[PDB]
Design a protein around this ligand. Structure first.
Ligand SMILES: [Ca+2]
Ligand SMILES: [Ca+2]
Length: 309
């Protein structure tokens, strides 16, 4: 008896959190079927209408993975990335995979926004934290990416493109070892169109794909970062399909990654992620999530997925 009404959604959620226990299905039936933008209007309407803070109430009413997914869904796009990078770096351990996932997949523009926001939210620069929590070549790649200075044009410099391919090839022909800085320079600095052309040229002169050379010539998180960049440049949806596969295959589940990817990409390219997932693994993302998770947690996850393939 109306279209999208933030106030009405606010009432549904409040009712769901009232009384003994919590009607999580009511919560899902609303939030999982609203856009990130709409969820922000709901937060505003809830505080206006109820005089309480929606995020605080959700946190006090929910727990575990279900809580993590719902709160993630409720967080504005930029702030979610910022809070995920911070979480990746707090504590003794560092979630380098998360750092790579975010820094290799977001545009230089989105990264610049994440930068300023990181600074305002915590008081330190994203770069400083990266420098403190990572080292050597991997640190350098992240420092470059985090600054968001990658060429944003679509300009193709023929001469430079040919030289880049050569430098990359020669980098894997050095006696002492792989001239890793070359990979960093080319893969972190050039614009997409230029890089994609460089990959073709590389293939021509080396008779091998850049990805296979990266896998045999480099290792560790540095290797992962380069691969992430290449994959995100060529077929970003496939990169996330793989990310999701790795988080669910074999004993257990990397819930942090599973949740972040499903939440962050739900409104961006989930359909294409699903297509690539089935192509790569023969199974549908839906079937994988369904058999690797459970509870209301699984329910919201399957909905973010969108349906079986
Ligand atoms: Ca309750
Ligand atoms: Ca598993």
């Amino acid at each position: 008896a109306s279209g999208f009404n933030a106030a009405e959604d606010a009432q549904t959620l409040r009712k769901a959190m009232k009384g003994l226990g919590t009607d999580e299905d009511a919560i899902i039936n609303v939030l999982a079927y609203r856009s990130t933008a709409q969820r922000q209007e709901i937060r505003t309407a809830y505080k206006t209408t109820i005089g309480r803070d929606l995020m605080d109430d959700l946190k006090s009413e929910l727990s575990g993975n279900f809580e993590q997914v719902i709160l993630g869904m409720m967080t504005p796009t930029v702030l979610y990335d910022v809070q995920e990078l911070r979480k990746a770096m707090k504590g003794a351990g560092t979630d380098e995979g998360c750092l790579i996932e975010i820094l290799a997949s977001r545009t230089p523009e989105e990264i610049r926004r994440i930068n300023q926001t990181y600074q305002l939210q915590y008081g330190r620069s994203l770069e400083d934290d990266i420098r403190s929590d990572t080292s050597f070549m991997f640190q350098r790649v992240l420092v470059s990416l985090s600054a968001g200075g990658r060429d944003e044009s679509n300009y193709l410099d023929d001469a430079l493109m040919r030289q880049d391919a050569q430098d990359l090839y020669e980098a894997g022909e050095k006696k002492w070892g792989t001239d890793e800085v070359k990979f960093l320079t080319v893969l972190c600095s050039r614009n997409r169109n230029h890089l994609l052309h460089v990959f073709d040229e590389y293939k021509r002169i080396a008779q091998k794909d850049i990805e296979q050379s990266i896998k045999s010539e480099t290792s560790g998180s540095f290797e992962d970062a380069l691969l992430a960049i290449v994959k995100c440049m060529r077929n970003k949806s496939a990169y996330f399909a793989e990310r999701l596969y790795k988080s669910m295959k074999g004993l257990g589940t990397d819930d942090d990654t599973l949740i972040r990817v499903m939440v962050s990409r739900a409104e961006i390219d989930m359909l294409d992620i699903r297509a690539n997932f089935k192509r790569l693994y023969g199974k549908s993302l839906y079937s994988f999530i369904k058999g690797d998770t459970s509870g209301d947690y699984r329910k919201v996850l399957l909905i973010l997925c969108g349906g079986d393939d």
